[PDB]
Amino acid sequence: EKFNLIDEPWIPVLKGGRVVEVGIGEALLRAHEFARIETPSPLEEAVLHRLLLAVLHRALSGPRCPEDVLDWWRKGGFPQDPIRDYLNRFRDRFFLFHPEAPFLQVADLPEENPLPWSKLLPELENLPKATYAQAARALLVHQAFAPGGLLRRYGVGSAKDAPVARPALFLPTGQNLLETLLLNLVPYTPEDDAPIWEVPPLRLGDLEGARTKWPLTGRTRVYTWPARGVRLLDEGDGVRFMGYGPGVEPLEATHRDPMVAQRLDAKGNLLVLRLSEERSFWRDFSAMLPRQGGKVAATLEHAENLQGELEDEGLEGRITLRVLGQVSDQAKVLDIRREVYPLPSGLLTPKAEENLEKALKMAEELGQGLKHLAQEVAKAVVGERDSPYLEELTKLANSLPLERLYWHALDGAFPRFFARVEEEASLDLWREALRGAALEAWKATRRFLGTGARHLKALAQGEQEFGRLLGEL
């Protein structure tokens, strides 16, 4: 019995400009003292929020109504008795090491032939000892973000994706940790849900051969999913190795995680919004709207509603939106990313949404034209069909700064536009930004094209076509 997550320092928070570590108790009871959960890993940031939310939802058996969240923001804190009563009732499920119920672990996982604790981390002797605080964070992350793939332990060939292994996570944020939790405390009922610690401790017998299958539903059940079997092995003052086996098999269900958005395919399947490379995330902001017809993250929906109510009572209504997740290449993870945007005053109003649809359409049409222009340049430079011809064309086209520079410039301009999406004058700001991004990108392509006599016919033609595109704004 060692290291209780309610009491020990393990959640890194910003307090008065310095980073300190706190336990679940203090993070909740004193949320307003911390500017934010502060960690270099976006996955850590996400899970630490999801765990705290899980506790709040159960301790508070709510909030049932958006009005309750406002009352708590107004008072400047959560009701405290319910929270300390709840933390007291479940204290003994919150030890990192425990004879019978270690937090998010399997007590009877075999101690011998363990794996390095590094397996928990995204990948993405020379094995360092982790602290309990680090082991705790790495566990929470792996349990939420682990991709499917080969396992081959205890009668399980391959494991399934952990719950949020794939989608971008929408996390609205305010001026302090209290406000940030409030902004994510989507109205909730306890019925038929339960986080991992409210259920009997899992045993290897239940997990071997994937014997235990759960429908992937229930908010706090999902926030605290036992995706893998883990048993961290205490080495005295830290952790190097763990027992490792299958977790609970997720059965498919209707439930959508509150932090997850959706959009439609090109006819006509719903998919989760994802982080990717080669695509700016905001380019999907219109497709996630109901009239498109995707589904907005419940957290985003709830924050935007709350913001409207804070503005109505003269309270500070300025909020930020953070998007957290993994870029994943099938079953590899390519990157961990944190994106940051304004949460515009009246985002989910017909006018703002309509400004958004137009803005993204303009950018997308101009970008499509720039893309074709780059393909024509590439054809012009290379020549006619005879290294693989088409690969040499794709190589060359990808080699031009045209599209890449265009989108990179719009990443810069989007937030200042987005923040004013409610207004009508913002379309004109955006139009100019489109023009400017296009110009800078083309200039950089002119430079690239003036280094040998080869590139010139393509330059002449391209200049002509670029003139065209621009004349249509």
Side-chain angles (χ1 to χ4, degrees):
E1 200 177 75
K2 186 189 288 192
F3 204 83
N4 200 281
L5 300 164
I6 300 156
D7 293 319
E8 296 302 314
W10 69 288
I11 306 171
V13 280
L14 191 57
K15 174 167 61 178
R18 66 187 167 276
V19 168
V20 294
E21 299 199 16
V22 307
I24 291 175
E26 177 173 1
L28 295 184
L29 295 174
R30 300 174 87 198
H32 64 292
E33 301 205 66
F34 315 118
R36 69 170 138 4
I37 286 167
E38 182 54 38
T39 164
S41 153
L43 309 187
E44 288 193 350
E45 176 175 8
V47 258
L48 294 166
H49 283 95
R50 291 160 63 80
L51 180 61
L52 295 180
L53 289 164
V55 177
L56 285 164
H57 280 318
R58 307 299 294 185
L60 290 179
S61 266
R64 302 300 187 98
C65 299
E67 272 290 342
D68 293 332
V69 169
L70 261 108
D71 301 346
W72 299 332
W73 182 298
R74 205 180 282 117
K75 296 170 189 298
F78 297 122
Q80 287 203 343
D81 257 333
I83 287 170
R84 51 174 76 103
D85 288 336
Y86 190 86
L87 290 173
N88 276 336
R89 169 182 295 146
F90 291 97
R91 174 163 264 99
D92 293 352
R93 299 293 304 263
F94 280 89
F95 291 100
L96 192 65
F97 314 87
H98 195 271
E100 297 183 16
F103 185 78
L104 256 182
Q105 301 170 69
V106 188
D108 63 349
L109 262 178
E111 186 188 17
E112 142 253 343
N113 295 334
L115 300 185
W117 75 275
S118 51
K119 170 69 162 178
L120 304 171
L121 304 177
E123 49 252 326
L124 198 61
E125 50 273 308
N126 309 14
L127 170 78
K129 180 168 65 194
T131 60
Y132 301 138
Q134 294 177 305
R137 284 181 234 116
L139 172 57
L140 208 59
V141 162
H142 182 70
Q143 222 56 306
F145 291 103
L150 196 165
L151 171 60
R152 239 173 244 176
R153 311 203 120 226
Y154 306 109
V156 172
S158 49
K160 264 80 175 183
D161 283 349
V164 293
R166 303 298 173 181
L169 301 179
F170 289 77
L171 185 97
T173 65
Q175 311 277 8
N176 60 44
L177 177 51
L178 173 60
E179 288 182 2
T180 294
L181 299 169
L182 291 182
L183 286 164
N184 292 269
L185 276 187
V186 177
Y188 165 86
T189 47
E191 58 168 7
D192 268 337
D193 184 37
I196 191 56
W197 56 83
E198 286 191 19
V199 151
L202 292 159
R203 296 273 180 269
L204 185 54
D206 314 324
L207 297 177
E208 288 185 7
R211 285 155 185 176
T212 302
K213 310 179 203 300
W214 288 350
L216 187 58
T217 190
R219 190 180 307 175
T220 73
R221 176 177 299 107
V222 176
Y223 284 176
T224 66
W225 197 265
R228 296 286 179 277
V230 180
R231 183 186 145 207
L232 304 164
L233 307 163
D234 186 0
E235 228 146 5
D237 52 352
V239 175
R240 286 192 194 91
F241 301 103
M242 51 180 179
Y244 198 71
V248 175
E249 297 282 304
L251 298 171
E252 134 169 338
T254 67
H255 181 262
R256 185 169 87 268
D257 196 280
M259 291 176 183
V260 172
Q262 298 179 307
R263 69 170 222 137
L264 289 172
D265 260 5
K267 279 181 169 184
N269 312 297
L270 272 166
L271 310 176
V272 308
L273 256 51
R274 292 188 198 208
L275 297 173
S276 64
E277 2 71 283
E278 190 78 9
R279 194 181 163 88
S280 309
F281 190 63
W282 52 268
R283 290 170 72 183
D284 292 318
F285 284 177
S286 184
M288 72 179 177
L289 305 181
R291 41 107 144 270
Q292 218 86 72
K295 284 148 183 171
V296 175
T299 57
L300 177 52
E301 192 177 30
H302 161 76
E304 193 277 0
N305 185 45
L306 190 61
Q307 177 183 62
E309 297 291 38
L310 296 165
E311 291 172 359
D312 281 343
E313 297 199 339
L315 300 200
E316 137 81 346
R318 290 178 306 181
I319 288 156
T320 283
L321 172 68
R322 293 162 81 111
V323 179
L324 306 175
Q326 294 186 123
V327 187
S328 67
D329 176 44
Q330 319 315 121
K332 299 269 188 182
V333 171
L334 271 170
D335 198 19
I336 310 311
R337 187 173 309 157
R338 169 192 289 108
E339 301 279 10
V340 187
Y341 311 92
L343 188 111
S345 200
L347 178 58
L348 310 173
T349 52
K351 64 186 62 184
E353 285 186 35
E354 173 227 70
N355 260 206
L356 183 57
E357 183 185 331
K358 287 155 76 178
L360 293 205
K361 178 144 65 76
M362 289 168 53
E364 209 64 57
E365 293 189 14
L366 172 57
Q368 186 85 342
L370 286 178
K371 187 253 227 56
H372 292 328
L373 190 163
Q375 294 173 340
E376 289 311 320
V377 163
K379 293 180 196 182
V381 165
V382 174
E384 296 196 283
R385 196 97 37 151
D386 210 272
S387 56
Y389 176 77
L390 284 183
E391 189 205 70
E392 177 177 354
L393 284 181
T394 303
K395 190 179 302 176
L396 175 63
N398 276 26
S399 149
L400 314 162
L402 194 47
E403 301 167 75
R404 175 193 101 242
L405 250 50
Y406 171 75
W407 291 111
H408 186 275
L410 295 185
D411 292 344
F414 183 74
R416 76 186 171 93
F417 156 80
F418 195 42
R420 299 172 52 181
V421 71
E422 200 179 2
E423 309 169 11
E424 55 287 287
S426 69
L427 265 172
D428 298 83
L429 191 78
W430 185 240
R431 201 172 268 107
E432 292 173 6
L434 286 208
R435 184 165 358 257
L439 288 167
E440 271 179 332
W442 171 246
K443 197 211 285 181
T445 310
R446 289 184 58 84
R447 283 197 285 267
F448 170 111
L449 283 186
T451 92
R454 68 204 134 159
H455 300 335
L456 285 194
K457 326 76 164 305
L459 182 61
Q461 298 180 22
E463 182 54 61
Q464 181 228 253
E465 162 69 2
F466 179 84
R468 272 216 43 260
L469 296 176
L470 227 58
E472 290 187 342
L473 271 169

